[PDB]
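Thread: sanity check for a docking pose with fe (iii) ion

Original post by kr_44:
Hi all, I'm comparing my docking run against an independent structure prediction. Below are the sequence and the ligand SMILES. Could someone generate the full complex and paste the structure tokens? I mainly care about where the ligand ends up relative to the chain.
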Amino acid sequence: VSKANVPKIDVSPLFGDDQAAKMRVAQQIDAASRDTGFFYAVNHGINVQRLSQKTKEFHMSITPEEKWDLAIRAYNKEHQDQVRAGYYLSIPGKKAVESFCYLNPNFTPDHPRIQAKTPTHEVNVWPDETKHPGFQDFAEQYYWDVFGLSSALLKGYALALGKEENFFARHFKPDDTLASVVLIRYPYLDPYPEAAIKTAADGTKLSFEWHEDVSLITVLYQSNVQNLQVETAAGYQDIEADDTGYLINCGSYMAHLTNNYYKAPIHRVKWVNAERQSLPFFVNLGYDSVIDPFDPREPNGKSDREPLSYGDYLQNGLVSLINKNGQT
Ligand SMILES: CSC[C@@H](NC(=O)[C@H](CS)NC(=O)CCC[C@H]([NH3+])C(=O)O)C(=O)O
Ligand SMILES: [Fe+3]
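Reply from moderator J.T.:
Ran it for you. Here is the predicted complex with fe (iii) ion included:
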């Protein structure tokens, strides 16, 4: 398989006030978005080594009892309110992956959307503080660090599409974003059960099948173990690993809003027998956020798509992804 073109882009100007330098970053985002759909954000300012260390400490110390106590409803019928947030268990002999998902720390018991029991909004669940000292505080702070990077990236995408820098960012707010962090553990297993390995039509062994992301953009940290592939006009291509940067791509809400000018790249996860991490941040807007679809390839910029609220998009997309590629 040939190597995919995934450029490294220094996104540091997006945190500053040099408008010309921001346009030069926006062009790089435009170019990558129009080519393979992927780029590595470098000079992003986040301490990813500490994120990996704290995540490993958690994954390797959590016990079976704690996983049931934090489990989503797909694994524990007693937790009917946990559709998104909580622990997603492995099934030894059958399913290797396991993970922990958390949402906006501002979704507290008194938040208006939590009081209304609005779909896709939940109060996070956390392990015992005595058993995992500092974990909740670290994880909540990580949400806000990656939120800050994501806001800066959204400024770059807006400028790239010919809009004002707050075009997307104005709908991405601390008090109501539906964004999520997922701490995914992909384990080393000896023997690796065949039931946990899928095979693509082209013969490639996979851990997760082809898909488009359910997001506006996805901001991903991964270990230094090659595993991702992107479908291009030249076929599936390997994405090189880089554990110092963030791998960025568009999700299907960006494809909808831009009329496929910036596509949501189809990508898949190869099977690798290695202990590693996949830590995505899905950049989701607010429940009622609606951006009128447009088309940057058309002179009048008009699109033939109907407006879709982010809440409707997200609820439907997450269900569809489970139906297509299985409960994770
Ligand atoms: C390289 S794909 C990256 C990663 N796979 C995932 O993260 C998959 C596909 S993006 N996403 C999902 O299952 C949606 C989770 C949504 C979350 N539960 C929520 O409530 O927000 C991986 O396997 O490495
Ligand atoms: Fe994905």
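Residues 84, 101, 180, 182, 184, 208, 211, 213, 228, 267, 269, 278, 280, 282, 318, 321, 328 surround ACC (ligand 1) (CB under 6 Å). Hope that helps with the comparison, let us know if your pose agrees.
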